[PDB]
Amino acid sequence: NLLVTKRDGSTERINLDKIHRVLDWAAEGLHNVSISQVELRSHIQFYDGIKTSDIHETIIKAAADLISRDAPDYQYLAARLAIFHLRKKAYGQFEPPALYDHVVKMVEMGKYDNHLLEDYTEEEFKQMDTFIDHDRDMTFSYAAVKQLEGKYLVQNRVTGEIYESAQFLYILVAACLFSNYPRETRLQYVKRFYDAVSTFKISLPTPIMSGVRTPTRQFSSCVLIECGDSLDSINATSSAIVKYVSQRAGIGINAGRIRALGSPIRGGEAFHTGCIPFYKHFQTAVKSCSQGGVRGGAATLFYPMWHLEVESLLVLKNNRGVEGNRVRHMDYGVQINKLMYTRLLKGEDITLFSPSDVPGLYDAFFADQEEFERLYTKYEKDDSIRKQRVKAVELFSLMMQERASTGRIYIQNVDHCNTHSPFDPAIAPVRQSNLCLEIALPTKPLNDVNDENGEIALCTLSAFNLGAINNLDELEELAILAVRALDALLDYQDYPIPAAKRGAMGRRTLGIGVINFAYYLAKHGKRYSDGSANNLTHKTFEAIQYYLLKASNELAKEQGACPWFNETTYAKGILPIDTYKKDLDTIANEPLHYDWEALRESIKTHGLRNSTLSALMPSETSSQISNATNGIEPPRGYVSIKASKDGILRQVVPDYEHLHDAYELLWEMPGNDGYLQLVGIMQKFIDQSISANTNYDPSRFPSGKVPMQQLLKDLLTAYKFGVKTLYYQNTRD
Amino acid sequence: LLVTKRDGSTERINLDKIHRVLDWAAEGLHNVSISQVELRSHIQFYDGIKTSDIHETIIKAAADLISRDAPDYQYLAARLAIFHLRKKAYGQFEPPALYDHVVKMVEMGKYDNHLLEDYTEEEFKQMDTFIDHDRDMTFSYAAVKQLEGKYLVQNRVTGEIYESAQFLYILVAACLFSNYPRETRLQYVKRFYDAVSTFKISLPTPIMSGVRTPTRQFSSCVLIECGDSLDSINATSSAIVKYVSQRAGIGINAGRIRALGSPIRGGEAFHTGCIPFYKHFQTAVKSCSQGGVRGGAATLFYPMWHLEVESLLVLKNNRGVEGNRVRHMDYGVQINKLMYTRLLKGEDITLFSPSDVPGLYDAFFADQEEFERLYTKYEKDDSIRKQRVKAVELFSLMMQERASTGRIYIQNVDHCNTHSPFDPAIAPVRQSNLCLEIALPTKPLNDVNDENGEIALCTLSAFNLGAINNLDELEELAILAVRALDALLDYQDYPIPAAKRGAMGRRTLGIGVINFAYYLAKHGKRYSDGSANNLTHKTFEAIQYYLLKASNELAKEQGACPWFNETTYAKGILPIDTYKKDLDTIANEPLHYDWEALRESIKTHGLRNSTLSALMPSETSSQISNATNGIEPPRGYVSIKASKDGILRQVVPDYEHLHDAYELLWEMPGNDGYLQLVGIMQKFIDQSISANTNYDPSRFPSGKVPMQQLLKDLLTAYKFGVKTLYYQNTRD
Ligand SMILES: Nc1ncnc2c1ncn2[C@@H]1O[C@H](COP(=O)(O)OP(=O)(O)OP(=O)(O)O)[C@@H](O)[C@H]1O
Ligand SMILES: Nc1ncnc2c1ncn2[C@@H]1O[C@H](COP(=O)(O)OP(=O)(O)OP(=O)(O)O)[C@@H](O)[C@H]1O
Ligand SMILES: Nc1ncnc2c1ncn2[C@@H]1O[C@H](COP(=O)(O)OP(=O)(O)OP(=O)(O)O)[C@@H](O)[C@H]1O
Ligand SMILES: Nc1ncnc2c1ncn2[C@@H]1O[C@H](COP(=O)(O)OP(=O)(O)OP(=O)(O)O)[C@@H](O)[C@H]1O
Ligand SMILES: Nc1ncnc2c1ncn2[C@@H]1O[C@H](COP(=O)(O)OP(=O)(O)OP(=O)(O)O)[C@@H](O)[C@H]1O
Ligand SMILES: Nc1ncnc2c1ncn2[C@@H]1O[C@H](COP(=O)(O)OP(=O)(O)OP(=O)(O)O)[C@@H](O)[C@H]1O
Ligand SMILES: [Mg+2]
Ligand SMILES: [Mg+2]
Ligand SMILES: [Mg+2]
Ligand SMILES: [Mg+2]
């Protein structure tokens, strides 16, 4: 007897059968889901005159609430109901319009870029429409759909109106990235790429998902800036930061060159007032376009362990101290090499220098370990040179102490970053990383914001979904698609700063990683902690790097190698399999399955389109679209619960039904050794670095406190197996 | 029984030797006891004591005896300290020949070689004859300590003193007039040397310490206007960093930056607020500083009607969190007639983001009539984003924060442009400097090296009103001061193109006064009862007239400044035409000089400098002349300041004869008398004045200064045309 209100404002007798019919549609093919249960929970919330839209939101939430381990398929029931609603919001009906008509409408509204209509004829759009399978919208999980609705689908940010659906996003991202291709291969490339992303084999970054097809050209999310030891450079660095955080890019700042407090300037006309005031200026630059502090501008700043002010720098994040000696809203990366670790093991001292007082020492720190030790010991014995001694154990302990309590004091092993690298350290050394410590690229300081002699490193990201591929040879096709799409994006996107354009156009660096690694391991019955996954990992990441290189090599044949290819180790016939940390042989015996020697000569002859290709990023948001486990990290639980604006979102690990015992949750792990070994094995093939976490449960330790001995042990274990960087330290509460 | 000589030789102590030294210093002094000093000194002697330490002992002994009862101890101590400095620098009392000194110092790298290129040995012999080294005996003890500490060329490592005061004076003169033709050069050098060495002209610290050395960093006063864009905010930030690294004070105009929530590029993004950008300017200002003692200093300016004004006014108080506080800068609130009108009428003030109100920001400075038109237009427009606040509440909040911190300043922007040397339509004054006496045109930069931007600089100096016998001496002194500072403009370096443009275009100078309190007591006048109004009028007419006359004659000789056409002076307008008419009610002193003759001469030949006068605080330079600080009344007859070398006492000039004539700061009833005097000054002053307000809570019931009184004085200042309000001093 109740009445419902239709969208037009008409009223109708309540019809539970209509709701039932919709529930039947979403429930198709699903198991262990109850339509009546959803009906039971939903109906009780109905009142006379309720909006049909509110009815729809009710049944979405009801199904979403029922997502559990016992009935994981509710994640698809809820998702599909939400898809049904999104269709209605965008098209006024379930079935999407013809592609060309949609594009024309959206260009007219100013939501799509007009160049789509310039680069493709109406007939070509008709063809592309035949590629699309809108039913692939029914394969998203509920968390995926919410991220779509929230971050990716083109919408009105004011009114909230949704203007598109997922497959239109996918097909037009494909269409844009391959628009400049010849007609002989263009639409063939579009279809193949569309299939790859819409069936979740290739995962794309947020700025691409939300931007590519729209009038924007801001797609850079990853920026690396090196600051020189001068006022002009500090200003330039600050300016560069401001422009890029205004475009929401994450920043990696190298400030290790800045001379220490008290150092003479121009021979003594003035004296340096310390690094920290300049660090503060970088922080306000990073936070310049942020309101409040929840998820604003983000940066990681890098400095060497032997820096004269290092004891002051290590404590910049802890909640104690006064405002004057604290710079809390950035993260930090301490740069370490073999000599530092040597002093630690020997229980000797570490000498601290200002880089301005030790000629050639800073450069050698990154490019030449033999020369560094020569210079370091030479300067250690010189009394004319300003210095300070600290016990290596005390210094390392202080560092790890702050890493533990804040979780955001990172490590960069700079020797590993240059002895095992795609770059010639004598010409293009790697002297820093990025915000999340997976990017490792060459940089050059600016003397002006528009200095054409400076080099700001950028990197375009993506990931392979290890859970969606049937066999490792599928990566051949996928690498071709990924590399070619990202490489085209380099020419597509805009560059607000000349030094950044130089790096991107000069080196054409890419960073392609993985997601669903944990699921991948459980699938094959392997685990993180017992070394059972070592050989599989070796096999898996050999395939990844080989096919990436093969794709970039063939891209180089077709369109030419990157302008600065000559500065790479690849150009000199060197491959990652030549320069890896030899200790890896003791923990993995999987043989090489691909013809690297044929590749070596093919790279020698034709070069690479891209200087780097692989990097393992955290990828927390993009993973949710594929319902994948996050990057290479193990899941914290079988079902994750996250509070949000639209309520509580539950997400189940892939194939929990059959793999619950096969999974190894994070806190089920004995320690960090097994994981660190896997990371080391990955790093054997990875061009750049890996966002590696360390994890600790205080409950597993006496007195409920993690001892320093263990922290130092794990640090050294990572270094032993060639791990380049260390990201988060997670401590279970 | 034995003393250790400088060579390390030893001889028997001879108290008669010390007695002889004390007699030299005591010559001409009254109420000083040599024996008193001897008694205090002798007790500290031990076997093998250094003669150097003996000298330091008798200096401190004499310094300790400085009092109201015996002020002349300030000269006894000083002369003893001078004696010591002579020995430290020359190995003997009498200085070497000037040329020999210069040659030695150039070789050591302490003096600039261009002195030897621009002057012949024979010319140095001539300059040496100008010098009277006995003028070193005319310093007070505080003056000598500032010399030793800040001015004399010395080794910063070892502490070695390399020169004496008269060499500083003669070589500052020689450098500033080095480019003059030989027909008149040494004549200018001698006249200028006499002026500074007899304390008639006071020079800024960066000039006193720098001019003769290899440096060219002499700018201490910088005004930068920030545009509403990322490029400009970056440019401004870079410029700030560069200038604070040269220890310049900064005035930042950030009022153009749009408010939090404003759309960007039509809604592609939304503004995240002014405050994060203010924080970025602060870290730029403090970028070359360690600790919070002194270091980088800046004042930031914004209009009262800015949409975020309520958030901006409280950026300094000690409460609140780090997120809504930017505490290490000072702020200047910009106000005009309409705001005050709304206050009096008890009406509302509407708050706008300058990005939402076309032409409103420009009119705020240049056109009050047009401002009122646009303001009321936008107030009635409902499509335009806005906020209403009670005028009483807004003014009270401002004054509340001004009182508790003392560092929230006021700029009356209409007074700064209706009574100004600049055409507001072409070159408006939209900000001030760190200490709020400077009022010059600016133009925002789109890059640190933007050659189209304009950063305002100003070169400072002051007349010592206590050292002049009559106001006609200012003719000579103005000629010397104006020519010296104008020469410095071509002498100094410019780290930023935009700064050079302003300096070369307008050649703006800021010359003020010191010893004003002493000057009033000398003439038997006081601050608070209006008895000094006409004297003040007479005095500052002479200052401005002779400054203009000097600059006008320099224009005949060397040409008017390139951008002279942007001045009101170019259109035949004088300060006496545009002053706040209310001044007629509090001063009836007639004009004593031929302003109409000057008017026609300025129309014909122009001015070398767009501005000439500005009244700065002048706390350090005042001590050299033993002058009272600027226009401010002294807080006591004897100031006590603790330092590394002990407690330094300084007596007001001629306390002996004028103790009853002085009017100390807290002997004052209120602010009315002083604000009237500042207003009368402002009639003739080109730029502005660092006017302080003072309050003694003891003089008020409940021990609290009421808001009605704060507003009362605020409106009193506005009534008499006062352009800016600097510090509020609240007695402890
Ligand atoms: N008369 C009704 N009684 C109960 N539920 C209804 C009724 N009409 C629609 N619904 C339900 O409301 C939800 C939203 O439906 P829908 O978006 O189609 O709105 P609508 O009011 O039917 O407008 P339209 O005319 O555009 O179809 C669906 O779950 C649908 O089954
Ligand atoms: N064939 C279909 N398969 C899946 N979802 C569909 C289909 N047809 C419609 N939907 C979705 O189901 C919801 C309701 O659609 P529809 O308007 O046809 O039914 P109804 O509202 O219950 O009845 P009616 O509007 O005709 O009174 C909408 O969200 C729509 O997008
Ligand atoms: N006045 C200053 N106060 C504090 N730090 C300063 C100052 N000037 C420069 N610095 C810092 O000291 C270093 C000097 O570098 P800079 O290039 O700007 O000066 P320079 O004239 O080239 O002298 P140098 O020969 O010492 O490099 C930089 O780290 C800069 O940040
Ligand atoms: N024998 C002495 N007994 C007491 N005081 C002395 C004696 N000799 C010097 N003095 C005092 O020591 C102070 C410093 O004198 P001065 O600089 O001349 O040192 P000095 O040892 O005499 O060196 P020089 O040989 O260069 O003259 C003066 O006040 C001087 O009167
Ligand atoms: N004629 C003078 N007038 C003023 N001060 C003088 C004079 N001659 C020297 N002085 C200063 O007085 C102090 C003492 O001078 P001086 O060295 O001649 O005497 P002394 O040290 O007491 O005796 P001695 O010849 O044994 O060194 C020094 O600081 C010196 O610069
Ligand atoms: N991404 C951003 N986040 C926050 N504030 C920003 C951002 N971009 C610019 N701003 C601020 O917005 C204002 C305008 O920026 P700017 O002039 O540089 O950009 P624009 O492209 O010219 O846009 P507009 O046409 O709105 O001026 C300035 O105050 C600037 O600081
Ligand atoms: Mg319907
Ligand atoms: Mg330098
Ligand atoms: Mg002697
Ligand atoms: Mg703009």
Please provide the DSSP assignment of B388-436 as one string. EEEHHHHHHHHHHHHHHHS-EEEEETTHHHHSSSB-TTTS------SSS
**Strands (E) located in B216-297:** 221-225, 249-253, 263-264, 269-270
Kindly state the tokens that stand for B7. 């060579």
Distance, in Å, from the CA atom of B45 to the CA atom of A148, rounded to the nearest integer, reads 88
Residues of B within 8 A of A242 (CB-CB) are 230, 233-234, 280
One-letter amino acid at B426 equals: I
Kindly state the tokens that stand for B687. 């730029």
Distance, in Å, from the CA atom of A611 to the CA atom of A508, rounded to the nearest integer, reads 6
Tell me the CA distances in angstroms from B320 to A174, A320, A684, B304, B331, one per residue in order: 51, 19, 52, 21, 17
Q: What is the DSSP letter of B213?
A: B
Sequence-distant (6+) residues with CB within 8 A of B708 are none
Residue A518 main-chain phi, psi, to 5 deg: -65, -45
CA dihedral B14, B19, B24, B26 (to 10 degrees): 160
Angle between helix B121-130 and helix B185-197 axes, rounded to 10 deg: 40
Distance, in Å, from the CA atom of A89 to the CA atom of B616, rounded to the nearest integer, reads 67
Residues of A within 8 A of B234 (CB-CB) are 238-239, 242-243, 449
Residue A89 main-chain phi, psi, to 5 deg: -65, -30
Distance, in Å, from the CA atom of A251 to the CA atom of A206, rounded to the nearest integer, reads 17
Distance, in Å, from the CA atom of A567 to the CA atom of A508, rounded to the nearest integer, reads 12
The closest of B512, B479, B335 to B417, measured between CA atoms, is B335
Dihedral angle sign, alpha carbons of residues A170, A171, A174, A176: negative
Instruction: Mark yes or no for CB contact A243/B233 under 8 Å.
Output: no
Tell me the CA distances in angstroms from B73 to B19, B32, B76, one per residue in order: 16, 6, 5
Fold (CATH) for A201-636+664-733: Anaerobic Ribonucleotide-triphosphate Reductase Large Chain (3.20.70)
- The residue contributing the CA closest to ligand 6 atom 24 is B265
Q: What is the DSSP letter of A624?
A: H
Distance, in Å, from the CA atom of A702 to the CA atom of A711, rounded to the nearest integer, reads 15
CATH architecture of the domain covering B200-635+663-732: Alpha-Beta Barrel (3.20)
How far from each other are the two terminal CA atoms of chain B, in whole angstroms? 50
User: Is the Cβ atom of A7 under 6 angstroms away from ligand 2?
Assistant: no
Tell me the CA distances in angstroms from A32 to A117, A649, A654, A663, B228, one per residue in order: 46, 20, 16, 22, 59
Q: What is the DSSP letter of A343?
A: H
CA dihedral B359, B364, B366, B368 (to 10 degrees): 110
Sequence-distant (6+) residues with CB within 8 A of A223 are A240, A244, A249, A250, A251, A252, A434, A456, A457, A458, A500
Q: Is B589 buried (19+), middle (13-18) or exposed (0-12) by CB count in 10 A?
A: middle
CB B288 within 8 A of CB B217: no
CB A732 within 8 A of CB A667: yes
B518-522 long-range contacts (CB < 8 A, ≥24 apart) are B518/B465, B518/B466, B518/B627, B518/B628, B518/B652, B518/B653, B518/B654, B518/B658, B519/B465, B519/B466, B520/B663, B521/B658, B521/B661, B521/B662, B521/B663, B522/B466, B522/B654, B522/B658, B522/B661
Resolution (A): 2.6
CB A231 within 8 A of CB B241: yes
Residue A422 main-chain phi, psi, to 5 deg: -75, 0
Kindly state the tokens that stand for A504. 């991107």
In the reported structure, the alpha carbon of residue B21 is separated from the centroid of ligand 5 by a whole-number distance in angstroms of 7
Task: Please report how many Cα atoms fall inside a 13 Å half-sphere around the Cα of residue B511, on the Cβ side.
Answer: 33
Which residue is listed with tokens 């699921």? A519
Q: Is A9 buried (19+), middle (13-18) or exposed (0-12) by CB count in 10 A?
A: exposed
Radius of gyration of chain B (CA): 27
Question: Given its phi and psi angles, is residue A62 left (phi above 0), alpha (psi -120 to 50 degrees) or beta?
Answer: alpha
Instruction: Mark yes or no for CB contact A324/B291 under 8 Å.
Output: yes
Instruction: Mark yes or no for CB contact B245/A239 under 8 Å.
Output: no
CB A19 within 8 A of CB A41: no
Distance, in Å, from the CA atom of A357 to the CA atom of A378, rounded to the nearest integer, reads 12
One-letter amino acid at A595 equals: D
Residue in A231, A287, A450 closest to B242 by CB: A231
Q: What is the DSSP letter of A390?
A: E
A690: distance to nearest CA of chain B, Å?
A: 33
In the reported structure, the alpha carbon of residue A254 is separated from the centroid of ligand 6 by a whole-number distance in angstroms of 26
Distance, in Å, from the CA atom of A128 to the CA atom of A632, rounded to the nearest integer, reads 35
Q: Quick one: which H or E segment has residue B185?
A: helix B185-197
User: What's the per-residue H, E or C state across A444-503?
Assistant: ECCCCCCCCCCECEECEEEEEECCCCCCHHHHHHHHHHHHHHHHHHHHHCCCCCHHHHHH
Distance, in Å, from the CA atom of B62 to the CA atom of B54, rounded to the nearest integer, reads 13
Q: Is A384 buried (19+), middle (13-18) or exposed (0-12) by CB count in 10 A?
A: exposed
Q: What strands, in cross-sheet order, belong to the sheet with A50-51? A: A11-13, A3-5, A50-51
Sequence-distant (6+) residues with CB within 8 A of A377 are none
One-letter amino acid at B508 equals: T
Active-site residue, A434 included: yes
Kindly state the tokens that stand for A165. 């659906």
Residues of A within 8 A of B241 (CB-CB) are 231, 234-235, 281
Residue in A278, A280, A290 closest to B272 by CB: A290
Question: Given its phi and psi angles, is residue B728 left (phi above 0), alpha (psi -120 to 50 degrees) or beta?
Answer: beta
Distance, in Å, from the CA atom of A192 to the CA atom of A483, rounded to the nearest integer, reads 13
DSSP states along B337-374: HHHHHHHHHT-EEEEB-GGGSTTHHHHHHH-HHHHHHH
The closest of B282, B284, B339, B281 to B306, measured between CA atoms, is B339
CB A691 within 8 A of CB A550: no
Distance, in Å, from the CA atom of B511 to the CA atom of B205, rounded to the nearest integer, reads 14
Residues of A in CB contact (< 8 Å) with B are 158, 231, 234-235, 238-239, 242-243, 246, 261, 268-270, 273-274, 277-278, 280-281, 283-285, 287-293, 323-324, 448-450
Question: Given its phi and psi angles, is residue B721 left (phi above 0), alpha (psi -120 to 50 degrees) or beta?
Answer: left
One-letter amino acid at B354 equals: P
With b for 16 or more beta-carbon neighbours within 10 A and e for fewer, the B64-103 pattern comes to ebbeeebbbbbbbbbbbbbbbbbbbbbeeeebbebbebbb
- The residue contributing the CA closest to ligand 1 atom 24 is A7
Distance, in Å, from the CA atom of A332 to the CA atom of A301, rounded to the nearest integer, reads 5
**How long a stretch of residues is chain B?**
732
Distance, in Å, from the CA atom of A101 to the CA atom of A292, rounded to the nearest integer, reads 42
User: What's the per-residue H, E or C state across B612-630?
Assistant: CECECCCCHHHHHCCCCCC
Distance, in Å, from the CA atom of A330 to the CA atom of A565, rounded to the nearest integer, reads 34
Distance, in Å, from the CA atom of B469 to the CA atom of B459, rounded to the nearest integer, reads 26
With b for 16 or more beta-carbon neighbours within 10 A and e for fewer, the A536-553 pattern comes to bbbbbbbbbbbbbbbbbb
The closest of A647, A619, A636 to A695, measured between CA atoms, is A636
CB A171 within 8 A of CB A212: no
Give the residues across from A388 on adjacent strands: A352
Kindly state the tokens that stand for A387. 């210095």
Radius of gyration of chain A (CA): 27
Tell me the CA distances in angstroms from B154 to B164, B213, B555, B623, one per residue in order: 10, 11, 38, 20
Kindly state the tokens that stand for B278. 């203010």
Question: Given its phi and psi angles, is residue A402 left (phi above 0), alpha (psi -120 to 50 degrees) or beta?
Answer: alpha
Kindly state the tokens that stand for A43. 């109906």
Q: What is the DSSP letter of B492?
A: S
Alpha helix segments (H runs only) across B636-721: 655-658, 672-682, 707-719
In the reported structure, the alpha carbon of residue A94 is separated from the centroid of ligand 2 by a whole-number distance in angstroms of 7
Distance, in Å, from the CA atom of A173 to the CA atom of A213, rounded to the nearest integer, reads 6
The closest of A543, A514, A542, A537 to A524, measured between CA atoms, is A537
User: Is the Cβ atom of B4 under 6 angstroms away from ligand 4?
Assistant: no
CA B566 to chain centre: 25
Residue A613 main-chain phi, psi, to 5 deg: -135, -35
Give the residues across from A511 on adjacent strands: A461
CA dihedral B580, B582, B583, B585 (to 10 degrees): 160
Question: Given its phi and psi angles, is residue A440 left (phi above 0), alpha (psi -120 to 50 degrees) or beta?
Answer: beta
The closest of B276, B311, B228 to A283, measured between CA atoms, is B276
One-letter amino acid at B101 equals: H
User: Is the Cβ atom of B21 under 6 angstroms away from ligand 5?
Assistant: yes
**Strands (E) located in A653-728:** 694-696, 725-726
One-letter amino acid at A462 equals: S
Residues of B within 8 A of A290 (CB-CB) are 272, 276
Residue B105 main-chain phi, psi, to 5 deg: -75, -30
Give the three-class secondary structure for A231: helix
| Boundaries of every domain in chain B | 1-199+636-662, 200-635+663-732
In the reported structure, the alpha carbon of residue B677 is separated from the centroid of ligand 9 by a whole-number distance in angstroms of 53
B489-495 long-range contacts (CB < 8 A, ≥24 apart) are B489/B459, B490/B179, B491/B175, B491/B176, B491/B211, B491/B216, B491/B218, B492/B216, B492/B217, B492/B218, B492/B219, B493/B216, B493/B217, B494/B219, B495/B242, B495/B243, B495/B246
Tell me the CA distances in angstroms from B113 to A376, B121, B122, B175, B213, one per residue in order: 41, 13, 16, 11, 9
CA angle (A652, A655, A656) in 5-degree steps: 60
Kindly state the tokens that stand for B291. 């600790």
**How long a stretch of residues is chain A?**
733
Q: What strands, in cross-sheet order, belong to the sheet with B221-225? A: B456-457, B221-225, B249-253, B298-303, B330-335, B408-412, B724-725
How far from each other are the two terminal CA atoms of chain A, in whole angstroms? 53
Residue A468 main-chain phi, psi, to 5 deg: -105, -5
Alpha helix segments (H runs only) across B27-159: 34-42, 51-64, 73-90, 98-107, 114-118, 121-130, 141-146
Sequence-distant (6+) residues with CB within 8 A of A294 are none
Give the three-class secondary structure for A9: coil
The closest of B92, B75, B73 to B83, measured between CA atoms, is B92
Tell me the CA distances in angstroms from B463 to B445, B468, B469, B519, B546, one per residue in order: 35, 9, 12, 12, 12
Experimental technique behind these coordinates: X-ray
DSSP states along A24-74: HHHHTT--S--HHHHHHHHHTT--TTEEHHHHHHHHHHHHHHT--SS-TTH
Dihedral angle sign, alpha carbons of residues B204, B206, B209, B212: negative
CA angle (B454, B455, B459) in 5-degree steps: 130
Q: Is A206 annotated as a binding residue?
A: yes
Give the residues across from A458 on adjacent strands: A223
Residues of B annotated as catalytic are 433, 435, 437
Distance, in Å, from the CA atom of B191 to the CA atom of B465, rounded to the nearest integer, reads 18
Task: Please report how many Cα atoms fall inside a 13 Å half-sphere around the Cα of residue A129, on the Cβ side.
Answer: 15
Distance, in Å, from the CA atom of B171 to the CA atom of A396, rounded to the nearest integer, reads 57
Distance, in Å, from the CA atom of A703 to the CA atom of A309, rounded to the nearest integer, reads 34
Residue A348: CB atoms within 10 A of its CB come to 12
Tell me the CA distances in angstroms from A140 to A30, A81, A147, one per residue in order: 13, 11, 11
Kindly state the tokens that stand for B46. 């031990």
Q: Is B585 buried (19+), middle (13-18) or exposed (0-12) by CB count in 10 A?
A: exposed
Task: Please report how many Cα atoms fall inside a 13 Å half-sphere around the Cα of residue A346, on the Cβ side.
Answer: 9
Distance, in Å, from the CA atom of A198 to the CA atom of A186, rounded to the nearest integer, reads 18
Catalytic residue among A413, A434, A610, A693: A434
Residue A449 main-chain phi, psi, to 5 deg: -60, -30
CB B454 within 8 A of CB B496: no
CB B653 within 8 A of CB B639: no
* Ligand 5 atom at minimum distance from B17 CA: 22
